[PDB]
Amino acid sequence: SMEQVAMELRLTELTRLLRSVLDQLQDKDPARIFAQPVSLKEVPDYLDHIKHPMDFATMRKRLEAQGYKNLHEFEEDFDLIIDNCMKYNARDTVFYRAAVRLRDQGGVVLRQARREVDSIG
């Protein structure tokens, strides 16, 4: 149908905007701490601690399959990256601290993304 096509164009354009959001948030992690999944070879107990692992590569795979329907879904995955790290790692670690800085700097980006998603519809 033509309605299905219009819906698909809307999803495509959200995907475009989320790709730009992802790139901007990933720039706030210049150490690449969050770039890839925590390795279960290197952290064998990880899944005993963290039930829903997340990382920027996994988000990018979902994004490119157009698997984010709305900005809330995308934000949920970004908050998992941060929240997982802040539980597994102690406050005195470069990992925890990187997550704090990513959360603080990402908030700015996400605030305007929400306005753009609502504004453009």
Curated annotation (Swiss-Prot):
> From which residue to which, out of the full length, is covered?
555 to 674 of 1058
| Gene name, Swiss-Prot/TrEMBL | BRD1
Q: What is this protein called?
A: Bromodomain-containing protein 1
> Subcellular localization, per the record?
Nucleus; Chromosome
**Source organism's superkingdom?**
Eukaryota
Tissue specificity field = Highly expressed in testis.
Domain Bromo stretches: 9-113
Origin species, per record, is: Homo sapiens (Human)
Role summary = Scaffold subunit of various histone acetyltransferase (HAT) complexes, such as the MOZ/MORF and HBO1 complexes, that acts as a regulator of hematopoiesis. Plays a key role in HBO1 complex by directing KAT7/HBO1 specificity towards histone H3 'Lys-14' acetylation (H3K14ac), thereby promoting erythroid differentiation.
Per UniProt, subunit arrangement is:
Component of some HBO1 complex composed of KAT7/HBO1, MEAF6, ING4 and BRD1/BRPF2. Component of the MOZ/MORF complex composed at least of ING5, KAT6A, KAT6B, MEAF6 and one of BRPF1, BRD1/BRPF2 and BRPF3. Interacts (via PHD-type zinc finger domain) with unmodified histone H3. Interacts (via PWWP domain) with dimethylated and trimethylated 'Lys-79' on histone H3.
Q: Where is this cross-link: Glycyl lysine isopeptide (Lys-Gly) (interchain with G-Cter in SUMO2)?
A: K41
